């Protein structure tokens, strides 16, 4: 995350971190329930074997609220391709259920119609992660969160040198130096409504990070809600 502020105690309980064999984070995810994690399909290619850690806010040192979970079933969308980064979504079923507690809780799955007319119509959404604080820097040892405005779909198609599919939406800033970044992929994009946060996106991609005239690109969760439910009932 470039810019923004730290996630203070208990503010981003739905954040999940994918860790490789070296126990280092390479991507994020969103806790959907005790057995399921939502993430980006392109992240599965960033590591041979990985586990899911939850309840962490400072990777620098374990404190007592963290929990590592082994993945049982990896479910990637069969239509994802590295060529376009379309259908950049996947759901993970854990072998053991997550125990909810301080800093460990799920984000709500909204309904399609209401979400599109009411959540994605809001001014902003929240993106979080342990990603880089700058484009060419190192990954953050502290979990960060960033309020990002929803971006006009037309304006974003114009600024992107890559096709913006119906399964993607744009958020962020044109000039301000605040954006998601490398290492934040698969993480949550949630929108707040009356003190309740709903999953509205998955950190997907962006030309560099926080570059002027470029926005952050996220997978449109509302276009996969049926797929998500289906992937969770099996």
């Amino acid at each position: 995350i470039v810019g923004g502020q730290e996630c203070k105690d208990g503010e981003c309980p739905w954040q999940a971190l994918l860790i490789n064999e070296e126990n280092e984070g390479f991507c994020g995810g969103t806790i959907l329930s005790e057995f399921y994690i939502l993430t980006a399909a392109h992240c599965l290619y960033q590591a041979k074997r990985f586990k899911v850690r939850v309840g962490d806010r400072n990777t620098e040192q374990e404190e007592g609220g963290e929990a590592v979970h082994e993945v049982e079933v990896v479910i990637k969308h069969n239509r994802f391709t590295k060529e376009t980064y379309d259908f950049d979504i996947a759901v993970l079923r854990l072998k053991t259920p997550i125990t909810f507690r301080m800093n460990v809780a799920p984000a709500c799955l909204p309904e399609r119609d209401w979400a599109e007319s009411t959540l994605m119509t809001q001014k902003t959404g929240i993106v979080s992660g342990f990603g880089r604080t700058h484009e060419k820097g190192r990954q953050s040892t502290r979990l960060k969160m960033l309020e990002v405005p929803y971006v006009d779909r037309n304006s974003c198609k114009l600024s992107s040198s890559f096709i913006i599919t119906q399964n993607m939406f744009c958020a962020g800033y044109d000039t301000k130096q605040e954006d998601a970044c490398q290492g934040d992929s698969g993480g949550p994009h949630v929108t707040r409504f009356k003190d309740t946060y709903f999953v509205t996106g998955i950190v997907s991609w962006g030309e560099g990070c926080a570059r002027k005239g470029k926005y952050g690109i996220y997978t449109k969760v509302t276009a996969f809600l049926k797929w998500i439910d289906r992937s969770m009932k099996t």
Partner: protein
């Protein structure tokens, strides 16, 4: 206006069924007796920051 009007006074989901507002809630919540508020059924309902 219905749902267009302040989300039909709904806590969460709002639907217009037969020209009338109909509220619903995410999984883990129960629609209150007033048919508008959403009540959590457990200590860690989805969407709530753990601010203890």
């Amino acid at each position: 206006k219905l749902c267009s009007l302040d989300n039909g006074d709904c806590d969460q989901f709002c639907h217009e069924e037969q020209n009338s507002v109909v509220c619903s809630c995410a999984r883990g919540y129960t629609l209150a007796d007033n048919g508008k508020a959403c009540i959590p059924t457990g200590p860690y309902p989805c969407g709530k920051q753990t601010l203890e």
